[PDB]
Amino acid sequence: VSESQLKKMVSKYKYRDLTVRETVNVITLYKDLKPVLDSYVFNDGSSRELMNLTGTIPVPYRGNTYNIPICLWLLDTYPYNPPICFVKPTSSMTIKTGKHVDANGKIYLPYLHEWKHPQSDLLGLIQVMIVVFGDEPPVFS
Amino acid sequence: MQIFVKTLTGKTITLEVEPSDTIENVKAKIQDKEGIPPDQQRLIFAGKQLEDGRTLSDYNIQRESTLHLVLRLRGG
Amino acid sequence: MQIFVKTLTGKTITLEVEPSDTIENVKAKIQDKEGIPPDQQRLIFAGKQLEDGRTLSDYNIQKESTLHLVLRLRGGD
């Protein structure tokens, strides 16, 4: 919440402004998404404080709207690099591994494989996630 | 369910645990397969360090899931 | 061992504690570096709130670990 607090959690980001703006443009359309500062321990064990967007996104399916929970991670430099998406399934959700989701929850979409920064953004990434998830549900009660 | 565990050398191990299995228990299973002391094992899922006081369902770990194992006592 | 502490503004602080160090002690060290009253400091590790009656080893905190500090009452500026 607040734009000031947002510019504080991303003070160690090479491209603050950009990130911020983009973030503001995201939470703006998807209020179900809120920024948070947490430590991301890579597989190598290393750790780093990055800002991710935790929450849920609306994905209409069979006339029903499912609020699939995701967690986008931004690296000190997410203005040119693709965020680390993840499907955080609840105790009442079962990951349906497919072409855009594995057993760990990792998300796979052409938008990430071909990420640039001049045309690629969070908003665009989220919108594309709703379109793909709409045709292919990564989870099922 | 069945899960996978990758190492730092490039070795994958398969284990059969249950959603009600604690991480401490998972460490023991790995100590019986590889012989790595639980006190010298670091599990990581989705970039998150699992605790020995939590279970698998607590982390939302489904089947065919992949976990990372890190050994301690080498650097800092 | 050495540990790190991030703030809500984006500031990292380095401290040298021991596995036998209590949480309350850690708060004092931060109060001498920044001057933040222990009663106005909230430590968090792995999404868990550390207690002032527990130690670092109790939370399985190793070296090079990162901790989060939260201010109560909204100190702000």
From Swiss-Prot, chain A:
Residues 1-141 form the UEV domain. Belongs to the ubiquitin-conjugating enzyme family. UEV subfamily. This is Tumor susceptibility gene 101 protein. Component of the ESCRT-I complex, a regulator of vesicular trafficking process. Binds to ubiquitinated cargo proteins and is required for the sorting of endocytic ubiquitinated cargos into multivesicular bodies (MVBs). Mediates the association between the ESCRT-0 and ESCRT-I complex. Required for completion of cytokinesis; the function requires CEP55. May be involved in cell growth and differentiation. Acts as a negative growth regulator. Involved in the budding of many viruses through an interaction with viral proteins that contain a late-budding motif P-[ST]-A-P. The UEV domain is required for the interaction of the complex with ubiquitin. It also mediates the interaction with PTAP/PSAP motifs of HIV-1 P6 protein and human spumaretrovirus Gag protein. Monoubiquitinated at multiple sites by LRSAM1 and by MGRN1. Ubiquitination inactivates it, possibly by regulating its shuttling between an active membrane-bound protein and an inactive soluble form. Ubiquitination by MGRN1 requires the presence of UBE2D1. The gene is TSG101. The chain holds residues 3 to 143 of 390 of the full protein. It comes from the Eukaryota. Component of the ESCRT-I complex (endosomal sorting complex required for transport I) which consists of TSG101, VPS28, a VPS37 protein (VPS37A to -D) and MVB12A or MVB12B in a 1:1:1:1 stoichiometry. Interacts with VPS37A, VPS37B and VPS37C. Interacts with DMAP1. Interacts with ubiquitin. Interacts with stathmin, GMCL and AATF. Component of an ESCRT-I complex (endosomal sorting complex required for transport I) which consists of TSG101, VPS28, VPS37A and UBAP1 in a 1:1:1:1 stoichiometry. Interacts with HGS; the interaction mediates the association with the ESCRT-0 complex. (Microbial infection) Interacts with HIV-1 p6. It is found in: Cytoplasm; Early endosome membrane; Late endosome membrane; Cytoplasm, Cytoskeleton, Microtubule organizing center, Centrosome. Heart, brain, placenta, lung, liver, skeletal, kidney and pancreas.
Swiss-Prot record, chain C:
Phosphorylated at Ser-65 by PINK1 during mitophagy. Phosphorylated ubiquitin specifically binds and activates parkin (PRKN), triggering mitophagy. Phosphorylation does not affect E1-mediated E2 charging of ubiquitin but affects discharging of E2 enzymes to form polyubiquitin chains. It also affects deubiquitination by deubiquitinase enzymes such as USP30. The modification (Microbial infection) ADP-ribosylthreonine is found at residue 66. Residues 1-76 form the Ubiquitin-like domain. Changing residue 65 to E: Phosphomimetic mutant that binds and activates PRKN. The modification Phosphoserine is found at residue 65. Transmembrane segments: none annotated. The record marks 68 as: Essential for function. It is found in: Cytoplasm; Nucleus; Mitochondrion outer membrane. Changing residue 72 to G: No effect on ADP-ribosylation. Exists either covalently attached to another protein, or free (unanchored). When covalently bound, it is conjugated to target proteins via an isopeptide bond either as a monomer (monoubiquitin), a polymer linked via different Lys residues of the ubiquitin (polyubiquitin chains) or a linear polymer linked via the initiator Met of the ubiquitin (linear polyubiquitin chains). This is Ubiquitin. It comes from Homo sapiens. The gene is UBB. The chain holds residues 1 to 77 of 229 of the full protein.
